[PDB]
Design a protein around this nucleic acid. Structure first.
Ligand SMILES: [Mg+2]
Ligand SMILES: [Mg+2]
Ligand SMILES: [Mg+2]
Ligand SMILES: [Mg+2]
Ligand SMILES: [Mg+2]
Ligand SMILES: [Mg+2]
Ligand SMILES: [Mg+2]
Ligand SMILES: [Mg+2]
Ligand SMILES: [Mg+2]
Ligand SMILES: [Mg+2]
Ligand SMILES: [Mg+2]
Ligand SMILES: [Mg+2]
Ligand SMILES: [Mg+2]
Ligand SMILES: [Mg+2]
Ligand SMILES: [Mg+2]
Ligand SMILES: [Mg+2]
Ligand SMILES: [Mg+2]
Ligand SMILES: [Mg+2]
Ligand SMILES: [Mg+2]
Ligand SMILES: [Mg+2]
Ligand SMILES: [Mg+2]
Ligand SMILES: [Mg+2]
Ligand SMILES: [Mg+2]
Ligand SMILES: [Mg+2]
Ligand SMILES: [Mg+2]
Ligand SMILES: [Mg+2]
Ligand SMILES: [Mg+2]
Ligand SMILES: [Mg+2]
Lengths: 124, 138
RNA sequence: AUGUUC
RNA sequence: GUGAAUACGUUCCCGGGCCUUGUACACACCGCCCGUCACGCCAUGGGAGCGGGCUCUACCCGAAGUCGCCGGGAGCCUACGGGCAGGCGCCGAGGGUAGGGCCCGUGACUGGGGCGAAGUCGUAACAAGGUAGCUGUACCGGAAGGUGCGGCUGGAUCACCUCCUUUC
RNA sequence: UGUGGACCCGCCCCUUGGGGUGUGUCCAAAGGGCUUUGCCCGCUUCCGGAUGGGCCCGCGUCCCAUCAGCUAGUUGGUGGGGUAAUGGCCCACCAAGGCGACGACGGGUAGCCGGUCUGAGAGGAUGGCCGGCCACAGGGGCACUGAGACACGGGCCCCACUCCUACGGGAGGCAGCAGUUAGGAAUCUUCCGCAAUGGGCGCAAGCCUGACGGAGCGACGCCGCUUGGAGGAAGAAGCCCUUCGGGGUGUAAACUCCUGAACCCGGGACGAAACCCCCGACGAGGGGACUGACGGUACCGGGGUAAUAGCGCCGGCCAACUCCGUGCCAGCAGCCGCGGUAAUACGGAGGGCGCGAGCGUUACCCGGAUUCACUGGGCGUAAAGGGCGUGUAGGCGGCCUGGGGCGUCCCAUGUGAAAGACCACGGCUCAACCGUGGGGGAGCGUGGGAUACGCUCAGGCUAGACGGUGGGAGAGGGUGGUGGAAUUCCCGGAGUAGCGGUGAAAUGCGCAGAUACCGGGAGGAACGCCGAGGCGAAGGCAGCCACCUGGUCCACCCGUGACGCUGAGGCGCGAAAGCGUGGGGAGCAAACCGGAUUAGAUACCCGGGUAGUCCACGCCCUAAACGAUGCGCGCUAGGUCUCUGGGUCUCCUGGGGGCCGAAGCUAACGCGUUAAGCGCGCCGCCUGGGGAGUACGGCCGCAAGGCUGAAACUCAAAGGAAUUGACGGGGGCCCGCACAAGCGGUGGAGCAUGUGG
């Protein structure tokens, strides 16, 4: 634009989009598993992926990935939702925080232990 | 009808220099001359002289170049590598003395209209005055 | 003249 | 051992070479790819309506309180020209009733939309894509689409035109 | 009583209600204590000071225009009321104003600032803690008291909600400190003390003070400190790899010395000297006394133990690799993408890298993002030039001289609080934290000054622009007419067996005589050759004639004298289709009917055919409305063809249209004096693809539809240009028993043999 145009109409400041109505802009959210179930990924990948539909304190029911080999979530398990999507399950915008509320840690886990909510194993 | 005669003058210089003209003609104004006075004094142009094309005042400006050069493309280097209007009718630019620009780290010159006349950055700074940033040259 | 698909 | 026929020609069929051209192909035409229809999931629009929020208009009732008039055939004080009670009124929080505006939520069902490794039907586009394509519009047809009119080249193999250009 | 003050009026000064003055009226007061003819505290009036305030004004202060009109105390006036005070603050009356695209009004969001975070900066984001201002105190209204409040722990009423109740009534407001409960991913002690500093009251003693000073809890944050130090093998064991020699962990450990966090012992703060008391005078000045929550804490001295280490990552970005398990599973994942049986990408091991009382994760902000671009981007083909004129506001404005000094620049000065930031020096053993001092800082006010540029007023010029005269080319537009060719049809003639049509056919026309030929006539549409270029802003415009009419070029250099450029809106124009009312209707021809073609053929080909195509009037307003290139101006080689003016005409000079090209630009293709180059002005537009030119809303339209125009969700691309290929029911050239020319076979029969089954 000419400077006069810029005077008259100016520049539109960007404005940008949450990936994550964990409402409020909370960093986490309590919810209850409504359904726990397995789903299949989008074309390139193939798996039986573990997700829970989750009804939230935030007023919203959404799906959420259950990370870790193995889990203990069932129909009313309480859960901490985390944010983070999965490039592979469409409309899974959130993860479940293992190690919190009714989400158990991941058993036998020994490497990336603090994700996966796993207590430091005893070196008896 | 020429919106910016200064700009048009600077642009006549740049256009001429890019085709290595001996000289060029620019319709005359007192202000235009005062700019050319400086271009000359700082050695970007050999100098100018008033003249009279078809019954009307011009300033014939005498362009200056470097030595002819070796290799493919022997075109002289420009003395005026760059000449750019700053203040312009659509956005006038004014700067007081303490925020006058240092152009190309000393090897360039800015030019301004001041209440003490048309001065370079160095003249103005040493005179203690600001003004309209007419253009910068290097 | 026409004359499909993988 | 004995021992032919035929080849005008290169239009056509299969394969291939060099230059050129278009290309949305590059797993390279046994390529790509379009739309209906069928199935699943997601988010939406519309939807008899229903339910809120805010708001505007008119009308009705109107607390407290300041303020204004009265305080008389009228009580109490008195410092009796006065004051206090008391009475009337304006404004007035709010409330009621009726009709608008805006916003939200929700709704049997329903239009299309996106996504869903290999669904059905045809083959519209990309090669003159086998009717050049695209386009606004209009009619028609399971579906792509077709056809009319006009436009565009982001098409044309040709041709012959005129221009440029390079001759030598 | 009236020092004085208030008020009306007059006078002087001053200039909005400021100061003085005269007469009239009107206005004060409170006592208490002592060692008492003296001191201390109070009381009253006035003047001045200081401090804190109120009200006013300039400028600054977010998103939506899919919010464009708003406004009745509304704008102003007069007179009142009210207040400390101006003011429609409130009320009568009068007038009809006031505000708005420089965004009124409306809707949404938000307390604002010093600062803070980020950033090279400009900017962007933020406004918790600390300071300043505002607002609120369960929601809403209201006043009272008062220097001050419309009052956080005061009051009234309404509403909401709760509590006590003997059922008569009562009571309540933690957004004070703690704390409970609920909501939440999540946020503390119902702590100590008034010793300090500050506040209220009191002569004082002192009382009160959840302000405050401290303690507590929490790695929440920052700074600091520890988990040892020096020695110690060509190098134990274990564990991992292994080419079965080794290699790695690793000087790491074990082990020897050394030091000595914690601990325990002794001692033990500063922060506190005032107020008060005494001398002096209850002044200055000198002297005395009390007082510590933190705390038996900090710290000092003396003893004294080898004494917590974990978290993330090792495919690329990114620093750090091997073995096993696994086998598109389990799983990873920020993006690219890893996983299909040798996976440095999954899980574990060993090993490594990075940090370290922390390390990671998620969320949000800035960065990277020159990806909203002022600094600092773009629109021919990538997203982006408005379909074209005309024009309003606005933005911008040639040459010369003077006046003004608003912009602008300069100087002084005021202001820019403190804290923070920055520099220096200092205090805590350092640092964090803190002190003290120093330099800054745009803004804005005031004074003085400069006048180049911008502005402004005045005069001037003629290079821009318009005009005069004279010439010109043109399918530029409109209305009227009229000319020939052709098609169709009608009436005839003449003549007879087919015409028509396709790849081939048929439908169809034709013995009621078609086709071809000739005469007569009608009617509609379009104008062959000329004809490639020309005109118009675009759309677009083609026989000839006449009238009306617009643009445009050139010449003379004759007149005006910057009158200019652009242009948000607005107005008008706008192909074709289409719509309405009429007309007209030859040819053509959506739809439609027939014939073919086909697997089907709702198409392509054939025969017919209605709207429509034509005209008038009125709509519609779109388009590949294209040069996919906004307008205007200046500047930067040329060559060549062409239209149309001018020229002491073998060339020059202007205006147009083309092709090739200097420099330059461009991602490239390409563009290049008809710019996409170099620049200035102004408009318009873009900001990944899809969703979608869709929905909603609004405007327009008779309707079809137009304009304006999102989001959810989704994808990791969509895309431009050029490159190498490959491909073509593209082209040119060229080959092979490829066809063609031939001769002989296979496919049929028996059988042999290989194969499917
Ligand atoms: Mg991992
Ligand atoms: Mg080829
Ligand atoms: Mg059709
Ligand atoms: Mg008054
Ligand atoms: Mg008051
Ligand atoms: Mg708020
Ligand atoms: Mg930056
Ligand atoms: Mg409360
Ligand atoms: Mg309270
Ligand atoms: Mg809770
Ligand atoms: Mg930026
Ligand atoms: Mg860009
Ligand atoms: Mg395109
Ligand atoms: Mg484009
Ligand atoms: Mg255009
Ligand atoms: Mg104007
Ligand atoms: Mg003048
Ligand atoms: Mg003249
Ligand atoms: Mg039209
Ligand atoms: Mg038409
Ligand atoms: Mg019609
Ligand atoms: Mg119709
Ligand atoms: Mg036909
Ligand atoms: Mg366009
Ligand atoms: Mg060119
Ligand atoms: Mg609509
Ligand atoms: Mg043969
Ligand atoms: Mg046989």
């Amino acid at each position: 634009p000419t400077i006069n145009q810029l005077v008259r109409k100016g520049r539109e400041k960007v404005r940008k989009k949450s990936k994550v109505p964990a409402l409020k802009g909370a960093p986490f959210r309590r919810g209850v598993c409504t359904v726990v179930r397995t789903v299949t990924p989008k074309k390139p990948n193939s798996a039986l992926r573990k997700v829970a539909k989750v009804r939230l304190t935030s007023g919203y029911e959404v799906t959420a990935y259950i990370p870790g080999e193995g889990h203990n979530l069932q129909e009313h398990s309480v859960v901490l939702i985390r944010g983070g999507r999965v490039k592979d399950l469409p409309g899974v915008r959130y993860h479940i925080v293992r190690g919190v509320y009714d989400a158990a840690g991941v058993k036998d886990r020994k490497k990336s232990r603090s994700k996966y909510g796993t207590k430091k194993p005893k070196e008896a | 009808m020429l919106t910016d005669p200064i700009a048009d003058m600077l642009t006549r210089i740049r256009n001429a220099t890019r085709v290595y003209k001996e000289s060029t003609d620019v319709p005359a104004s007192r202000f235009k001359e005062e700019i050319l006075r400086i271009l000359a004094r700082e050695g970007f142009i050999k100098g100018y002289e008033r003249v009279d094309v078809d019954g009307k005042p011009y300033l014939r400006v005498y362009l200056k170049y470097g030595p002819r050069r070796q290799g493919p493309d022997p075109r002289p280097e420009q003395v005026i590598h760059h000449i750019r209007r700053i203040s312009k009718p659509g956005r006038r630019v004014y700067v007081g003395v303490k925020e006058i620009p240092r152009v190309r780290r000393g090897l360039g010159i800015a030019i301004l209209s001041t209440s003490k006349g048309v001065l370079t950055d160095r003249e103005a700074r040493k005179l203690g005055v600001g003004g309209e940033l007419i253009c910068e040259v290097w």
